Amino acid sequence: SRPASDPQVVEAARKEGRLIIYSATDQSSAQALLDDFRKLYPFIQIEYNDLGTQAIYDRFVSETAAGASSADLLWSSAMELQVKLASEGYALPYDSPEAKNWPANARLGNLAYSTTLEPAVVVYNKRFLKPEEVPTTREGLARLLQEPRMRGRVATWDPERSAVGFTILKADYDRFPAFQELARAFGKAQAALYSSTGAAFEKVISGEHYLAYGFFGSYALLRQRTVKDLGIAYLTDGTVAIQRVAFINKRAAHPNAAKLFLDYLLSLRGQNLMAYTALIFARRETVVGEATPQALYKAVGGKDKVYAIPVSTEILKNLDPAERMRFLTFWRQAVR
Ligand SMILES: O=S([O-])[O-]
Numbered sequence: 001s002r003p004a005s006d007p008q009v010v011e012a013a014r015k016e017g018r019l020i021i022y023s024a025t026d027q028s029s030a031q032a033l034l035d036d037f038r039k040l041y042p043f044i045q046i047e048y049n050d051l052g053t054q055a056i057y058d059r060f061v062s063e064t065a066a067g068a069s070s071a072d073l074l075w076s077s078a079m080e081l082q083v084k085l086a087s088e089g090y091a092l093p094y095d096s097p098e099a100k101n102w103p104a105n106a107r108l109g110n111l112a113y114s115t116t117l118e119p120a121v122v123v124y125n126k127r128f129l130k131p132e133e134v135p136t137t138r139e140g141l142a143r144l145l146q147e148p149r150m151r152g153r154v155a156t157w158d159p160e161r162s163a164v165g166f167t168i169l170k171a172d173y174d175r176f177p178a179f180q181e182l183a184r185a186f187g188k189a190q191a192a193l194y195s196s197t198g199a200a201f202e203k204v205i206s207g208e209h210y211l212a213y214g215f216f217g218s219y220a221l222l223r224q225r226t227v228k229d230l231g232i233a234y235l236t237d238g239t240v241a242i243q244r245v246a247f248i249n250k251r252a253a254h255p256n257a258a259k260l261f262l263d264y265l266l267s268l269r270g271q272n273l274m275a276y277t278a279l280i281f282a283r284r285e286t287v288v289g290e291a292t293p294q295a296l297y298k299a300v301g302g303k304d305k306v307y308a309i310p311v312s313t314e315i316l317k318n319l320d321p322a323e324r325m326r327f328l329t330f331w332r333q334a335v336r
């Protein structure tokens with residue numbers, strides 16, 4: 001039940017009566033959260049803007065620079081872009097009463113918050129690869145992708161075009177040495193490179209591709225409901241998890257509505273609704289559903305096989321020229 005937002009915030013939110021969100025989260029994934037927020041707080045008109053991760057950063061920066069009305073709350077899997085904004089004066093400092101036991105590495109102090117722990121998984125078409133054929137390690141996937149029969153049948157992110165594709169593949173490269181071998185295997189298999197989870201899943205579902213690497217498990221579980229032939233394989237040699245980052249615009253027209261929504265996302269109710277109905281992999285460990293930390297940990301063989309990218313300024317290294325250059329120079333030569 002009800003998030004522990006202050007009564008004064010709730011009244012103030014009622015005077016605002018509107019809530020502008022910029023979000024990367026596919027609205028079809030996010031809808032159950034909007035619907036459930038509407039029941040808590042029927043008096044808040046929501047404008048959900050489903051936008052690419054890069055478009056959110058560019059939109060917010062230019063709107064802000066012009067004095068324009070922008071969003072009240074920004075929610076996105078592009079973790080570098082969000083931590084940059086939130087560490088540079090775009091964030092309203094708010095100490096959420098629902099985050100008192102958030103680890104220090106899932107919050108930028110009072111400036112920004114992790115709302116999810118979403119694994120980068122393998123999705124495959126069971127009509128072309130049965131489960132016993134899909135390896136669960138970067139080594140195994142590399143050997144599979146040496147098969148001629150797999151040439152043209154693999155998708156992954158374009159880290160040059162998707163800002164969250166950059167987040168995932170950069171974290172894969174920093175933490176798993178076997179990633180390099182796997183990247184070159186993508187070059188051998190003429191891997192096709194995608195700027196959205198949806199584009200890659202359709203191609204996999206159609207059979208144009210047999211296997212997609214590094215897309216959100218959240219989206220793949222939702223799609224599985226409707227597509228029997230869509231398979232999910234979790235990596236047992238190490239799993240990158242993103243934490244979808246939430247902050248309030250310092251210059252929100254409706255800061256208290258943004259506070260309620262943030263508090264909702266962090267609450268036992270939002271996290272449970274995430275795990276059970278939105279099928280978004282929740283941040284809280286005491287959640288019930290398919291999309292949970294406990295179902296991820298079981299799948300990969302323990303919490304210690306998950307590298308959770310922290311909501312920290314440390315990850316801005318990923319935007320420093322020399323760090324950006326080494327990754328993308330590696331990636332372009334590997335993938336060919
Ligand atoms: O591959 S399905 O069984 O998650």
Ligand SMILES: [Mn+2]
Nearest residue numbers: 024025026051
């Ligand atoms: Mn999306």
